[PDB]
Design a protein around this ligand. Structure first.
Ligand SMILES: Nc1ncnc2c1ncn2[C@@H]1O[C@H](COP(=O)(O)OP(=O)(O)O)[C@@H](O)[C@H]1O
Ligand SMILES: [Mg+2]
Ligand SMILES: [Zn+2]
Lengths: 48, 637, 134
């Protein structure tokens, strides 16, 4: 139950029931972004 | 530094432009138009923008098409450079007083990229997408400094600096935050030279999922669109819109150590205002020379009025003079704006009081569907705040302000509050809405023709009683209605069987491309606000009936290219009929005032517009007075 | 055109220089950023070394030829913004690049030292020298 979540559940898999009362707008998260240095042209890629 | 791939794509798009000659024709026409009114005035200047059909590009080069759709940042700049090179190549005659960058706009089938603000996700980023929605917010059209010109008085020299932001290019640059030059390189104070600096119009609109397709009860989704220097002011809040643009991601999304996620918006390339029913967007239609020829051909016919009257609502049986009045209101009269400032109304209002099920609402829904610009309202479903304007320090247009130069179809007119009734009183004759609220004294234009449906006091029009007791509406309000039609459901065997055979024939109808037992599909008809004249399906079985699209074309042509002038030979008939109606004792359904002289004049002008005549002849006045006498008394002379 | 703007042409100057006709001893800091003619004796000539002014690379995965231009402080009379562009060891999108020698551009560079001529230098005094880049 949502009221029965203590600090022993932190960073652990928990199953909890409830009702959704809000769904925010989708936001864009970078999963793979190419980067380049400003005072250079060094191309690199960061993968998420 | 030049790029080989960039040049290859430039030459490929140049080949594409050479293959499809319509694009040189469009660019040449734009250039000659600009040069011609440049030399004329030493009107308006057409933008350096070309509509590109994506279907033609797919036919020519499918990878170039897929590259533009999927990788616009790498394929749109080369295509724009090719178009600019082509335009400067044809520019043998330069405008009086490469160069002049030409922008591209896209149209056609987008496939999976034709989306909505709800279905536009993060995997559409950096793609050319067409988003359909409703405009909810339009920011101020603000100038953006793209080149500042300064003057150094000590040296007497003019300097300049160009500015660049992240939204002006599809590709990402190195950011160069060049400061505003407040002094020369060597210490001389600079003076900004406004009027020689370059400012580019910039607008940021918000496109939200349309109410007709957004899920019910769910919070809507919105997307930001940025318009630059020619797409600004192309739409207004509440407009249905189709924006074609590159779904871009900007900023760092909190990664750059100084946001929850990346800032995403659409760099608008094309803006199409769409026409949806009961919206504030009129219905522009393309009139080919064949269409105009057919319109003139039919206008030459004597009974064209009748042909246009019966073809309005063939599905409704009867209501023939009501259809004539509806057609005249669709045409309408011509408003008069005298030099001193007074205004004479040229819009025809119609009221239909009647028994239950005499098709008053179907005749309202038909007018809503077929009119160029029509807004549908119901009594007490929209108040004076919802009908007229509303103060939000800013004004929000109501039903009769959005329907300016249009039609307002009010169902259940009797179930309207008096607070709304007074505002309607103002809107019908003076065609204006004066707010004078919360420090906002504004006179909005509400030049709209009102068609309304109402029920009697007891729910059944008692023929024993008089109309004044059966209507229960203010007499001053009934005066504004140019034509008041009382329709009664009289049970007569001939018309009983005839209306029932019609109702069943209409119910026994099949579309050309449907099976016997196939449920007819239905779309929302999002027409773009820019092949036979007659109709195959005839519920009546008789004169010929024209198709609704052709009738809309005819109404548009007569409404936009015919301005009839009253004549003495029509004035004699109008004056005689008005004097008789005022003086003759006949127990009229509606009172006779000086407004009656002007509904005679307006109906005569509308019928003259029907015949495509530039002068109101005697026959127009006679038929106008005939319809009016029917509407007041019920005569058939 | 020669078989197989473009082809930058350089200028060389001759004539009377007046006060700018100097020697390594009389060439002071108030002649800086001036066109001067210096007469002297060559004492040192460095090796004629190539200087990379454009590197051409090949990406085998895409099979495409890329290039990068290099600039230093001595190649232009005016001062630029310094742009230390690194040597491209890979493409923008991760493909390994192979340097294409023979398509890259190397420019000969020499640094000589001009010293006051013995016939005009003061006797018994340490001579003055100036660096010249060719
Ligand atoms: N004279 C008529 N001819 C054809 N259909 C009619 C007629 N009168 C009523 N109907 C049918 O009756 C139905 C209801 O009419 P409606 O417009 O809702 O009536 P009301 O004006 O009383 O609201 C519609 O399907 C309409 O086609
Ligand atoms: Mg009704
Ligand atoms: Zn670096």
């Amino acid at each position: 139950p949502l009221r029965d979540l203590d600090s022993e559940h932190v960073s652990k898999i928990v199953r909890l029931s409830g009702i959704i009362i809000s769904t925010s707008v989708l936001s864009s998260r970078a999963t793979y972004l190419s980067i380049m240095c400003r005072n250079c042209r060094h191309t690199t890629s960061i993968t998420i | 530094a030049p790029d080989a791939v960039f040049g290859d794509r430039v030459r490929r798009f140049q080949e594409f432009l050479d293959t499809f000659t319509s694009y040189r024709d469009s660019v040449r026409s734009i250039q000659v138009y600009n040069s011609n009114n440049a030399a004329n005035y030493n009107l308006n200047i057409l933008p350096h923008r070309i509509i590109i059909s994506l279907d033609d590009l797919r036919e020519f080069d499918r990878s170039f098409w897929s590259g533009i759709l999927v990788e616009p940042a790498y394929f749109i700049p080369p295509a724009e450079k090719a178009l600019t090179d082509l335009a400067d190549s044809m520019d043998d005659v330069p405008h009086p007083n490469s160069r002049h960058p030409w922008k591209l706009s896209f149209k056609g089938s987008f496939g999976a990229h034709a989306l909505s603000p709800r279905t536009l996700t993060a995997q559409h980023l950096n793609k050319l997408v067409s988003v359909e929605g409703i405009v909810t917010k339009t920011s101020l059209v603000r100038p953006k400094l793209i080149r500042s010109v300064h003057y150094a008085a000590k040296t007497g020299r003019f300097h300049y600096r160009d500015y660049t932001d992240a939204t002006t290019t599809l590709t990402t640059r190195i950011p160069t935050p060049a400061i505003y030059p407040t002094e020369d390189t060597e210490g001389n104070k600079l003076t900004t030279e406004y009027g020689y600096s370059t400012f580019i119009d910039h607008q940021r609109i918000t496109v939200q999922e349309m109410p007709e397709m957004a899920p019910a009860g769910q919070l809507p989704r919105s997307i930001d669109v940025i318009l630059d220097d020619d797409l600004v002011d192309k739409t207004k809040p509440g407009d249905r819109v189709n924006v074609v643009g590159v779904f871009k991601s900007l900023g760092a999304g909190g990664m750059n150590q100084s946001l929850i996620g990346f800032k995403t918006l659409i760099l608008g390339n094309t803006v199409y205002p769409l026409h949806a029913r009961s919206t504030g967007v009129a219905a522009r239609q393309m009139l080919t020379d064949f269409d105009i020829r057919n319109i003139n051909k039919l206008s030459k016919k004597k009974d064209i009025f009748d042909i246009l009257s019966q073809s309005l609502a063939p599905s409704i049986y009867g209501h023939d003079h009501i259809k004539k009045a509806i057609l005249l209101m669709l045409m309408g009269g011509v408003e008069k704006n005298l030099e001193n400032g007074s205004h004479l109304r040229g819009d025809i209002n119609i009221l239909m009081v009647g028994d239950p099920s005499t098709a008053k609402s179907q005749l309202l829904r038909f007018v809503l569907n077929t009119a160029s610009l029509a807004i549908a309202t119901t009594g007490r479903g929209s108040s004076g705040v919802g009908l007229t304007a509303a103060v939000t320090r800013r004004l929000e247009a109501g039903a009769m302000v959005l329907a300016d130069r249009g039609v307002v179809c009010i169902d259940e007119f009797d179930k309207m509050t008096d607070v709304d009734r007074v505002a309607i009183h103002e809107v019908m004759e003076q065609q204006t809405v004066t707010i004078a609220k919360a420090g906002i004294h504004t006179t909005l234009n509400a030049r709209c023709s009102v068609i309304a449906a109402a029920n009697p006091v007891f729910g059944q029009y008692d023929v024993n009683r008089d109309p004044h007791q059966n209507i229960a509406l203010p007499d001053s309000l009934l005066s504004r209605f140019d034509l008041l039609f009382v329709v009664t459901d009289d049970i007569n065997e001939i018309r009983d069987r005839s209306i029932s055979e019609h109702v069943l024939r209409t119910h026994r109808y099949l579309p050309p491309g449907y099976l016997e037992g196939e449920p007819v599909r239905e779309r929302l008809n999002l027409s773009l606000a820019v092949d036979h004249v007659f109709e195959k399906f005839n519920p009546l079985l008789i004169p010929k009936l024209v198709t609704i699209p052709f009738l809309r074309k005819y109404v548009q042509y007569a409404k936009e290219r015919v301005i009839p002038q009253l004549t003495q030979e029509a004035i004699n008939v109008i004056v005689k009929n008005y004097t008789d109606l005022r003086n003759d004792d006949n127990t009229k359904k509606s009172p006779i005032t000086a407004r009656t002289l002007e509904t005679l004049i307006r109906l005569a002008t509308a019928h003259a517009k029907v015949r495509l005549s530039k002068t109101v002849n005697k026959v127009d006045a006679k038929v106008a007075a005939n319809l009016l006498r029917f509407a007041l008394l019920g005569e058939d002379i």
